[PDB]
Design a protein around this ligand. Structure first.
Ligand SMILES: NC(=O)c1ccc[n+]([C@@H]2O[C@H](COP(=O)([O-])OP(=O)(O)OC[C@H]3O[C@@H](n4cnc5c(N)ncnc54)[C@H](O)[C@@H]3O)[C@@H](O)[C@H]2O)c1
Ligand SMILES: NC(=O)c1ccc[n+]([C@@H]2O[C@H](COP(=O)([O-])OP(=O)(O)OC[C@H]3O[C@@H](n4cnc5c(N)ncnc54)[C@H](O)[C@@H]3O)[C@@H](O)[C@H]2O)c1
Lengths: 487, 488
């Protein structure tokens, strides 16, 4: 807890302009530090490149041993890291600890994924004795969001390091402290010098890193906007492997449910967990028009009003905490303000709970006939649309260029079956909230939610490239020569 | 038996573009005549492939597999006729064109196993419920085909794509349109629904109209790192369209400490001169240890290399290699080794034009040990040799290229190979076997300027299907322990 930078195993103040991380509700300063400058970034990259040569040579077993030690250190400091996350983001403790346990779980699963997606295989084939092994890329710049400053960046870092990569981690300028803590835990775990390198900063720092001509890969978790910016930047440079993980305008369907409070439960999970700040949250809820939906939305609004929202560490733990900043909340309020005047009516008003904080109350808005923008956004603002035929519901679900998550809450399996059949989305759930993905299976958005480099399990796919060999043992003539060959 | 028509939505139709023709590389006579697809022709192909996708993606995996297997039946059934088309239109000798066909046939079952492993259907019980994983096709994929293997490579994209439920708008090389039309007719006679594959002949203009078309959902490419980079630059900012690039390489072959001379000379000639050196995995640069051993080796290598025959694809006794794709290309190769010799290099074996205005080139070997030539890819039987001192200097040379397709070593000492694998950055790396003759059973993806990390061959299945993972439950109902702040 110092505010430094980290390069080649050494902690050093940044040469860039200082910035600070403020707590979303208290407003006081939680972090102070210097942002990485241009030459600072050149240093991080040069030293990760240097460390690569020695790190790529470590066996898979050794790299796994260091990473696992990192996991043991995660368990040992679970509460302190949880408290750091919740403190700096506004997420409640009970949820931050969830993010930590997720970081821990990302390890063994990343191991199995490495061994299946990019393992070592040996076989006898027609052209001789074929063998297949997987090689790391080199220096991968990892960008971290602010909603999960521990789970997601980790989900890039573990698979990459394990496979022999070296990392230049640039966290969000809204969650630098959690980043510094995680880096210290990699140090205290015995990670060779320069194998991971921390570069704090904001937009300028990320600019200097992304354009840097010596990175060998870039792994991104963040807004579809900046993700597309990066993808355009690398236009014409296929040599640098890019992984883009972006948002979505995720739809949730709830039709013909026999357990009301159950569907209200899973719905509230999907739309409001993490203050609606989980990238897999449902931003659009679809309910069959008429009487049945009226009953459902009645109960859903009833229970949603009952949700508590307070500081990350309130004596009785609330359901959700603050939004990252008071400004973000301001833009959300202006957002639903633009929705209402567009023609929508408020089923449940999104309210600012304390004077100049990011504490927002749940918000539900009906714009069934209205046409708002296809735009992603974090916050507890849920747009609801009422539909006639189910074949119309499927039309609505796909009514977005994003393609991350989508699912249906229903007792009828065939609604799910036809959903899976028709929907164009990354993860599509039935009777479980859109949130809470499984790291044991891929996690890759389609459309504007990724560039077809799915992470989580298939993370192992974009951390290592394949080397295939036809081994012989002795260069010697075939039984029957080809035409035109005389000896 | 051929026509020269385009093929869209199951219908054969003359193209609306300007006419062109496919010439035999040595005979000079016309082998194909047809109209290239125009802008609206391509818009039609794409629109109709998109329409057909909706119906094709819903077929089960088994049914699509059955149609493709029927395609295999037809490949075996017409093996010799398709071989003759390939050899005729490219100049490749018959005996190896027959190989290209057998490779097309083999690309099927392996594409199946690949689909079931890399993008299958799996189910497991996990913490968040009963999780399931299935793999979906992208949609309309534009497939561009080379000219060295107008059958094997395009197929290596098409089978994996069709099988996974994609539809294809195939644009073949304007140097091998006939092979394309014939192959398409073979897909027709195989029962492929209308619009699931759509042939769009043409040259640069046609391919541009296809790549720029705002309705493709993927682009699969095999061709020069030059045009490949052009395409990649084009899609800059469009991650929604999945792109796979398969590009060339400045492939190095090292031969040090071989106790069987004629064997290593064999594998060398295979790697550098097979198919007139027009296989993308050919060794463009041979590395031989400085001094006596390399002197003897290269001596033998030139002796035997001179003994190579080169003639028409249908020579009475089949030669080792045929003509290069065109006489003009050959012209640029001659200009190439001329620029190397005047650059400071010495000619170990002169590349000569065997007939006046043809693509018949004789093997060419050039020593440029001290000279610095361009890091550039090129097809042709022109082999540059580099002599090295320490083995770590040989490794220094191998990576002396921005391309990263193939590389291998001819040696009796396994540890030289081990140090190669450890250090070399290339897609496929062979030991004591020719650089040519890859294995469709294992991935095939070049690094650096040889691809964008969407390797084909076995891993083709990865860029033909995207993953959908689901947490199924059965009934939306409250958990045992609620979250804090939820009242009912
Ligand atoms: N796909 C996912 O799993 C996932 C996860 C989290 C968030 N999201 C999406 O992201 C939205 C919020 O954005 P966010 O804050 O998480 O990510 P972001 O846009 O802030 O990007 C992460 C970091 O990259 C750096 N950066 C900013 N500008 C840059 C630039 N121009 N060039 C290089 N680096 C730059 C900053 O550190 C920035 O905070 C969410 O509401 C949701 O839409 C998606
Ligand atoms: N990666 C591999 O496996 C592989 C395979 C074969 C050849 N190669 C290499 O590629 C080169 C030979 O390939 P080639 O000359 O057939 O490639 P190419 O550039 O001719 O590409 C094939 C076809 O694409 C079309 N085309 C041309 N310009 C286009 C454009 N601007 N936009 C869209 N389409 C366009 C034309 O039909 C062209 O002939 C050599 O470097 C060779 O070694 C690599």
């Amino acid at each position: 807890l110092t505010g430094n930078v980290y390069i080649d195993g050494l902690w050093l103040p940044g040469h860039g302009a200082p910035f600070e991380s403020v707590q979303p509700v208290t407003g006081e300063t939680v972090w102070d530090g210097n942002a990485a400058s241009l030459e600072d970034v050149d240093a991080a990259v040069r030293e990760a490149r240097k460390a690569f040569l020695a790190w790529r040579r470590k066996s898979l077993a050794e790299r796994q041993a260091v990473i696992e030690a990192f996991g043991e250190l995660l368990e040992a400091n679970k509460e302190e890291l949880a408290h750091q996350i919740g403190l700096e983001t506004g997420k409640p403790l009970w949820e931050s600890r969830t993010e930590v346990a997720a970081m821990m779980g990302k390890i063994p699963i990343s191991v199995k994924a490495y061994n299946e997606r990019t393992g070592h295989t040996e076989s006898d084939v027609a052209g001789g004795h074929a063998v297949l092994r997987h090689r790391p890329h080199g220096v991968v710049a990892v960008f971290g969001p602010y909603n999960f400053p521990g789970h997601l960046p980790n989900g890039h870092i573990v698979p990459a390091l394990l496979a022999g990569n070296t990392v230049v981690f640039k966290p969000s300028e809204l969650t630098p402290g959690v980043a510094e803590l995680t880096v210290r835990l990699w140090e205290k775990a015995g990670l060779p010098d320069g194998v991971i390198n921390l570069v704090q900063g904001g937009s300028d720092t990320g600019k200097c890193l992304a354009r840097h001509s010596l990175i060998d890969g870039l792994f991104f978790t963040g807004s579809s906007t900046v993700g597309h910016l990066l993808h355009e930047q690398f236009g014409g440079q296929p040599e640098k492997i890019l992984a883009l993980e972006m948002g979505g305008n995720n739809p949730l369907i709830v039709q013909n449910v026999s357990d009301l409070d159950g569907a209200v439960h899973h719905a509230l999970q999907s739309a409001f967990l993490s203050a609606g700040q989980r990238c897999t949250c449902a931003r659009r809820l679809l309910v069959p028009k008429g009487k049945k939906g009226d009953e459902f939305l009645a109960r859903l609004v009833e229970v949603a009003a009952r949700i508590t929202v307070a500081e990350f560490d309130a004596d009785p733990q609330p359901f959700m905490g603050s939004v990252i900043s008071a400004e973000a909340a301001n833009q959300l309020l202006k957002a639903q303000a633009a929705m209402l005047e567009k023609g929508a009516t408020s089923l449940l008003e999104m309210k600012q709970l304390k004077p100049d904080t990011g504490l927002l109350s749940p918000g539900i808005v009906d714009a069934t006939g209205i046409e708002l923008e296809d735009q992603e956004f974090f916050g507890p603002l849920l747009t609801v649309y009422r539909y006639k035929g189910f074949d119309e519901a499927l039309e609505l679900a796909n009514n977005t260029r994003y393609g991350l998550s989508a699912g249906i809450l229903s007792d009828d399996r065939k609604l799910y079956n036809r959903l899976v059949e028709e929907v164009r989305a990354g993860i599509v759930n039935w009777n479980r909230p859109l949130t809470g993905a499984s790291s044991a299976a891929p996690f890759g958005g389609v459309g504007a939610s990724g560039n077809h480099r799915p992470s989580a399990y298939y993370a192992a796919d974009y951390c290592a490239w394949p080397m295939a060999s036809l081994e012989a043992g002795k260069s010697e003539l075939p039984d029957s020569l080809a035409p035109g060959l005389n000896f």
